Each structure stands twice: as C-alpha cells, then as structure tokens.
Amino acid sequence: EFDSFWFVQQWPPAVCSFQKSGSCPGSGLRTFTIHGLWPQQSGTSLTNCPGSPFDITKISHLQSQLNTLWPTVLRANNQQFWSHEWTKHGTCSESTFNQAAYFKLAVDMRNNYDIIGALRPHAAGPNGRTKSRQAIKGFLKAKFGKFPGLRCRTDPQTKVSYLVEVVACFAQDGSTLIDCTRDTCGANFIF
Numbered sequence: 764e765f766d767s768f769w770f771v772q773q774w775p776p777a778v779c780s781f782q783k784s785g786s787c788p789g790s791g792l793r794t795f796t797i798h799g800l801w802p803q804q805s806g807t808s809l810t811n812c813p814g815s816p817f818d819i820t821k822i823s824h825l826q827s828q829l830n831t832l833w834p835t836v837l838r839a840n841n842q843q844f845w846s847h848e849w850t851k852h853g854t855c856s857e858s859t860f861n862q863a864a865y866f867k868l869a870v871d872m873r874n875n876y877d878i879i880g881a882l883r884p885h886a887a888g889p890n891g892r893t894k895s896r897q898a899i900k901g902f903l904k905a906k907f908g909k910f911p912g913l914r915c916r917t918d919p920q921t922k923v924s925y926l927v928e929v930v931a932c933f934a935q936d937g938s939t940l941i942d943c944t945r946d947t948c949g950a951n952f953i954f
C-alpha cells in the first residue's frame with residue numbers, strides 16, 4: 764500500500780517559536796528530534812490505516828531511546844505522541860514492519876541522519892540567521908547521498924520564514940535513501 768517513507772525530524776526551538784503563549788518544552792532543546800515516520804503513496808502520506816492497536820509492551824526495550832529521540836516537544840506525555848504516530852501513520856506500513864520494527868526503524872534512522880552534524884562543518888548550523896534552501900539541501904545530499912525535503916513555517920506577524928522540519932525520504936524497504944520531491948520552504952529561511 765506504500766511506495767516510500769517520509770522520515771520527518773523537527774527542530775524543537777523553531778517549532779515552539781510559533782506557540783505565542785503557554786509552555787513548550789521544545790524551546791530548550793538543541794538537536795533535531797523525531798516527529799514521525801510516515802508511509803507514503805503517490806506523493807501523499809497514508810494515514811489512519813486499519814491495524815493493531817498501539818501496544819507499549821512491544822517497544823518497552825526502546826523507551827530510553829524513544830524518550831531521548833522521540834519526545835513530544837509541545838506537550839508532556841511522550842507515549843501519547845508515540846501512540847498517535849503509530850495509529851495514524853505506523854499502521855500503514857504494518858504489513859512489513861510490526862510495531863517493534865517500526866519504532867526501531869525510526870530510532871535507527873535518527874541515529875543515521877544527524878542533521879546538525881552534517882551542517883556544522885560547512886558553517887551551516889543554526890544561529891537564527893538566514894540560510895539558503897539549495898545550500899542546505901546541497902550539504903545534506905553531499906553527506907547522505909540524496910536530497911532531503913525542507914519544511915518551513917511563516918510567522919503570521921512578521922512574515923519571516925523559519926525552517927521547522929527536515930525530511931529524509933526512504934524507499935519501501937525502509938533503509939535505502941531516495942530523493943525527496945517537495946519542499947515547503949522558499950529560497951531562503953531563518954535557521
């Protein structure tokens with residue numbers, strides 16, 4: 764039912780910068796974390812596929828890694844976030860990846876796709892300054908071999924565009940990187 768995966772990582776500070784009021788734990792993180800692993804089909808995310816109910820016992824061995832790499836950055840309950848991501852996205856690839864394998868896949872993908880690490884050397888790390896879409900995609904392609912998908916958000920008040928997420932696209936095997944085909948960023952953005 765799926766032809767690929769979108770492995771979506773979020774930049775905590777940027778994500779939380781849009782919540783103009785209230786608390787947001789993401790305001791203090793300094794590394795990219797996991798938003799989700801989304802099975803794809805025909806250029807769109809497959810969602811809410813019939814499948815097994817979320818079962819925390821299937822990933823109990825990964826709780827340390829998941830609390831570190833897949834915390835919620837908006838709320839406080841990490842498990843609630845994992846459950847939601849499984850039911851809305853994970854079920855769509857359960858035909859080949861059971862819950863344990865799906866979450867292990869996301870963890871391995873995160874450990875194998877260190878965004879800041881790939882940008883740091885080329886002086887492209889975050890600093891609240893303007894960055895080039897082609898430059899950033901170029902540095903990530905040079906390091907990982909394929910083009911990532913960049914996701915930006917515009918501040919409703921200043922109209923300034925900020926990088927909020929980076930997508931690594933994978934083939935249906937969930938291991939072979941492929942080029943992403945869409946960005947929601949303009950030629951330049953703050954990072």
Ligand SMILES: Nc1nc2c(ncn2[C@@H]2O[C@H](COP(=O)(O)O)[C@@H](O)[C@H]2O)c(=O)[nH]1
Pocket residue numbers: 773798799834835836837838844847848851
């Ligand atoms: N993007 C995002 N959503 C989160 C996070 N923690 C909890 N959520 C919740 O998960 C929803 C994301 O749904 P998704 O787009 O992954 O299907 C959000 O609307 C929000 O209510 C987080 O760290 N990032």
